[PDB]
Ligand binder design. Structure first.
Ligand code: EUN
Length: 296
C-alpha cells in the first residue's frame, strides 16, 4: 500500500505533517504523512476510518492507513481519495458561486456533519461523532460541486446505549479562529457529548458565512475572508479570539445585500442560530440540514 504509492507532488506542509498527491494503481490519491508531534491524530483517524468504518459522500473518502519505516523512524500514512479542486478555503478564492452552487456546498457540508453527529443503531452501528476542528481548510470540494469533511484527528464519539463518551487522548487543540466561545472561556462541559456537537455547529455557522459571502446576488459578491478577518490577526491567539468572541460578543457581520436574496437571507438566519453564546440555543446539524433542504 504505502510502499506501493508513487509520491508525485507535495500539496501541503505544516505542523501536522505533509500532504502529497500520489499515484496508486494508476489513479490519484491523497497521502498524509503525519508529523511525529501529531501521531495521536493518526491513531484517531485510523480508528474512525478503519474501526468505525466512517464513510459518507460528504466525508473525505478513506482508502488505507499504513506505517512505513525509513531512516530509522516510522512514518504514519493516511491515504484517501484525491480532490483536484482542493480545500473549500482555496476553492472559495478562485470562484464566485451562484445559488445552486452555494446551496450544494452548504447542504453537503451539513449532510456530512449530520452524518457525523447522528448515531446509527444496530449491531455495529456508527457512534455519534463530533468533529471539533471544522473549518473551510478541512473541507474538500469534489468535482460534482458537493464537499466532504476531512480531518477526524480530534473526533469525539458517543453511544447513547452505553452513554459512553470517548474523547480520545490527543494533545492537539482545534483551530483557534473557529473555537466556540465556551471553548475560549473554558466553560464547556467536557464530559457532555452535546457540548462537542454544539462546538461543531458554531464552526459550521462560520463556514456558512465564508461560503455565503461568495454567492452572487444582484451582481454583488463579497471578497473571500476568513471568519473574524477584521478583528484578529493571522494565526490568532486564545486571548485574541476570547476578546472578540467572548468579551465583545462579536459575530461575523451579515452584509446588507444578503437581505436582497431569499437564499442568502435564509442562510443569514441559519448561521446566526449557530452563533448563540448559549451553546444549547444553537441549531442541531439535522435541523440545519432540514432547513437547508427546504431552501431553493
Ligand atoms: C489539492 C488537494 N489538497 C488536499 C489537501 C489536504 C487533504 C487532506 C485533508 C485532510 N485530511 C487528509 C488526510 C489524508 C490525505 C489528505 C488529507 C486533501 C484530501 C487534499 C486533496 O484531496 N486535494
Amino acid at each position: 500500500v504505502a510502499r506501493d504509492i508513487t509520491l508525485l507532488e507535495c500539496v501541503g506542509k505544516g505542523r501536522y505533517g505533509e500532504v502529497w498527491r500520489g499515484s496508486w494503481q494508476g489513479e490519484n490519491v491523497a497521502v498524509k504523512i503525519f508529523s511525529s508531534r501529531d501521531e495521536k491524530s493518526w491513531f484517531r483517524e485510523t480508528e474512525l476510518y478503519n474501526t468505525v468504518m466512517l464513510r459518507h459522500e460528504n466525508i473525505l473518502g478513506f482508502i488505507a492507513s499504513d506505517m512505513t519505516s525509513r531512516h530509522s523512524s516510522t512514518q504514519l500514512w493516511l491515504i484517501t481519495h484525491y480532490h483536484e479542486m482542493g480545500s473549500l478555503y482555496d476553492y472559495l478564492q478562485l470562484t464566485t458561486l451562484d445559488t445552486v452552487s452555494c446551496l450544494r456546498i452548504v447542504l453537503s457540508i451539513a449532510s456530512g456533519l449530520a452524518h457525523l453527529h447522528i448515531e446509527i443503531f444496530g449491531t455495529q452501528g456508527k457512534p455519534a461523532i463530533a468533529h471539533r476542528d471544522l473549518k473551510s481548510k478541512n473541507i474538500l470540494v469534489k468535482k460534482n460541486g458537493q464537499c466532504c469533511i476531512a480531518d477526524l484527528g480530534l473526533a469525539v464519539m458517543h453511544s447513547q446505549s452505553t452513554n459512553q463518551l470517548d474523547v480520545g487522548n490527543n494533545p492537539r487543540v482545534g483551530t483557534k479562529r473557529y473555537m466556540a466561545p465556551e471553548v475560549l472561556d473554558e466553560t464547556i462541559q467536557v464530559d457532555c457529548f452535546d457540548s462537542y456537537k454544539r462546538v461543531d455547529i458554531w464552526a459550521f455557522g462560520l463556514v456558512l458565512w465564508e461560503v455565503a459571502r461568495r454567492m452572487v446576488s444582484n451582481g454583488i459578491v463579497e471578497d473571500y475572508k476568513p471568519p473574524f478577518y477584521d478583528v484578529v490577526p493571522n494565526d490568532p491567539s486564545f486571548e485574541d479570539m476570547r476578546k472578540v468572541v467572548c468579551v465583545d460578543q462579536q459575530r461575523p457581520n451579515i452584509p446588507n445585500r444578503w437581505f436582497s436574496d431569499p437564499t442568502l437571507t435564509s442562510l443569514a438566519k441559519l448561521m446566526k442560530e449557530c452563533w448563540y453564546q448559549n451553546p444549547s440555543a444553537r441549531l442541531t446539524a439535522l435541523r440545519i440540514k432540514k432547513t437547508l433542504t427546504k431552501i431553493d
